[PDB]
Enzyme design. Sequence first.
Site, PDB file in Angstrom:
ATOM      1  N   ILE A  41      31.639  42.935  40.281  1.00 22.95           N
ATOM      2  CA  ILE A  41      32.623  43.500  41.217  1.00 22.95           C
ATOM      3  C   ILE A  41      32.937  44.953  40.837  1.00 22.95           C
ATOM      4  CG2 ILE A  41      34.989  43.252  42.177  1.00 22.95           C
ATOM      5  CD1 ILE A  41      34.637  40.177  41.407  1.00 22.95           C
ATOM      6  N   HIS A  42      33.077  45.208  39.542  1.00 20.58           N
ATOM      7  CA  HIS A  42      33.321  46.554  39.073  1.00 20.58           C
ATOM      8  C   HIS A  42      32.209  47.517  39.515  1.00 20.58           C
ATOM      9  CE1 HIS A  42      34.504  49.854  36.363  1.00 20.58           C
ATOM     10  NE2 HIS A  42      33.218  49.928  36.063  1.00 20.58           N
ATOM     11  N   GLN A  43      30.954  47.083  39.440  1.00 15.30           N
ATOM     12  CA  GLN A  43      29.838  47.941  39.829  1.00 15.30           C
ATOM     13  C   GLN A  43      29.959  48.369  41.284  1.00 15.30           C
ATOM     14  OE1 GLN A  43      28.911  48.989  36.519  1.00 15.30           O
ATOM     15  NE2 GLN A  43      27.304  49.582  37.990  1.00 15.30           N
ATOM     16  N   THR A 100      37.989  48.100  40.059  1.00 14.68           N
ATOM     17  CA  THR A 100      38.395  46.820  39.497  1.00 14.68           C
ATOM     18  C   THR A 100      38.087  46.759  37.990  1.00 14.68           C
ATOM     19  OG1 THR A 100      36.321  45.776  40.264  1.00 14.68           O
ATOM     20  CG2 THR A 100      38.244  45.620  41.730  1.00 14.68           C
ATOM     21  N   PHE A 140      33.431  50.651  41.664  1.00 16.05           N
ATOM     22  CA  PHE A 140      33.347  51.910  40.915  1.00 16.05           C
ATOM     23  C   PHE A 140      32.443  52.891  41.650  1.00 16.05           C
ATOM     24  CE2 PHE A 140      31.648  54.867  37.842  1.00 16.05           C
ATOM     25  CZ  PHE A 140      32.775  55.232  37.111  1.00 16.05           C
TER      26      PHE A 140
END
Lengths: 243, 243, 243
Positions: free
Chosen positions: A225-227, A133, A230
């Site tokens: 959210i990216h963490q 994301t 990913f």
Amino acid sequence: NAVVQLTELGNGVVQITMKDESSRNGFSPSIVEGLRHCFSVVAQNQQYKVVILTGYGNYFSSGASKEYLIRKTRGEVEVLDLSGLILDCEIPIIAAMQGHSFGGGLLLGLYADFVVFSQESVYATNFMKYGFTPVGATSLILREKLGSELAQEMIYTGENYRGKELAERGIPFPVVSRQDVLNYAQQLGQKIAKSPRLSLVALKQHLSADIKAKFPEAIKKELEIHQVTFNQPEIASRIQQEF
Amino acid sequence: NAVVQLTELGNGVVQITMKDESSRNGFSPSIVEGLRHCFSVVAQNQQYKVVILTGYGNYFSSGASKEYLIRKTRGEVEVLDLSGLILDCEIPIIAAMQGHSFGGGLLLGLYADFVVFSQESVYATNFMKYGFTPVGATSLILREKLGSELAQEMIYTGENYRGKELAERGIPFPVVSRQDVLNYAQQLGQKIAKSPRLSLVALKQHLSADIKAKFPEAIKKELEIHQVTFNQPEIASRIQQEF
Amino acid sequence: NAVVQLTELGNGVVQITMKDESSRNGFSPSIVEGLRHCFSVVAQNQQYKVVILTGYGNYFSSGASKEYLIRKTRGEVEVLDLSGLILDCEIPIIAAMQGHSFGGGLLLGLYADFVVFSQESVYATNFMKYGFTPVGATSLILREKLGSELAQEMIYTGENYRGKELAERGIPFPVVSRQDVLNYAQQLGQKIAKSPRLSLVALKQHLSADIKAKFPEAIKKELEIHQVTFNQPEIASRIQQEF
């Protein structure tokens, strides 16, 4: 010479040109430091009224490097965020995107007050292409500037869109031939620069207030959210195959 | 006769026509009092369901007069605000802008529920042309109705746009030939007037709620900024040169 | 066989097809139960990543039946609300509206993440045609997806618009020939399905958060107004004449 250069165009219009050929105007240390320096020179010169931000050759900004993303998979770095840098500028910015813009590179341009696209160049928020994301308040900014529907397709697919395809899609910004992009931005800058600086600054502060209010929470939410997305098993391999 | 006249078009559709040739439908005492009177007649007549607001000849509304602005520079007046007047109307309004609209005159039309533009006429939020920031919740209304990007260009530049140019830009409203504008508004009014009045009133209240909530603060914020930017040394001379 | 069928298209793309010819894909008990069942099968199958929702023949969804509305006038029922059903789905939905969509039927499609319209088919939020205000957070959803101006015209008039007319109006969604609608949705679904499911789910939750926050109050507000406007003397007769 420095890879980011400031030039005066007359009547308080200035141009900041990114030319890091080695990284194709990626978010390299040279580009980050050059942007910071050029924007500081701008802040100090009260005669300047409009900034035109542009690239060189076929590239506006290619954003974060694939080598950087690989380093990230081994948890070796943190996430760069140039929003503060651009959003702190108190005078209007026109992003003359004469070349391709990818990922944070497209966001960099969309942080500006006005944006000009090239018909022939390619634009993408390609985080989802690698399988994770976005960061940088991509959905806030893209939805506000491009409209919710185009923003959603671009974010979910992560695909490359030509400027001409975006124009056919009804993007709210000018899309012109590559050789006309910077000239178009310059003419617009000159129109804007007819106003007193005090008025430009006051107006920009007023108009930017709603988004600026929402920005810190948006950046935070997207980072969280990216963490998660990913740091999933298959991401490293997906990044490998995008080389 | 009065410079603002109300006529019945049938089926509860009424037309309020502004015809102050002396001021070119500017915000003259005659126009303000005529609008107030015609809208009061409307409020009282429960058989009316849709108002079409239009001008005469080449002008919808030229807004505040340059003579008024000059008077303002010597701190001699206060800021007129017709929003309350238009926003208080409980039935749908269609602004048939068959002619030019400037400044508050464009806002007057954009306060309406539906708007029809003329291809050949010119439209501007020209506050920044004189060198100061807008009043009247211009940025709230213009961004909501025209979209943020067109709104921003129009507000920053203060320039005159032909209806045809706005259409090419993707404005969300109908833009038709000058001789077709009022007819288009009338046909739309007749479609809307097919519904029961109670339903029209309830629906309009529902749909207008979000903007109406934001309006008092927007008007206030813009006024405060306008007072600062208007009262700067060079403004009087800028106004002189726009005569 | 069941009137709502789920089929697999490959790569985690699935298609839910509504085919209740007897009601023309109206909100019949068979359609409601079939949708609930097919969405439950989807929720359970973690390999699925994108749903394409479509109709049969000339109809996507004709919404609530006129026989149902008549029953309502005698206060005999309550208001169906399928929003929870569609909005609960955690993966992206593309509504391939290859045929006509009316009332709740258009909303059903617009609840989806992506929407594809047919050039030749007709679309309407026709509550106001019968003379009463909408239900289902019509104004929230339509204004968000279609833009405020198109949304307003469609809601106030209640009229039937061909897809081609909507496209000419600048609707932000693809409008293609009827025979190309489902194929277009399928190709888009395949692009989206390239991402990991975890990322699709996380992204959808993020992007939907703002509207989902506003939804319960919007549904409530519209219901309250609908109850008043529906229960007026002349409504029964208006419904009779729409048969």
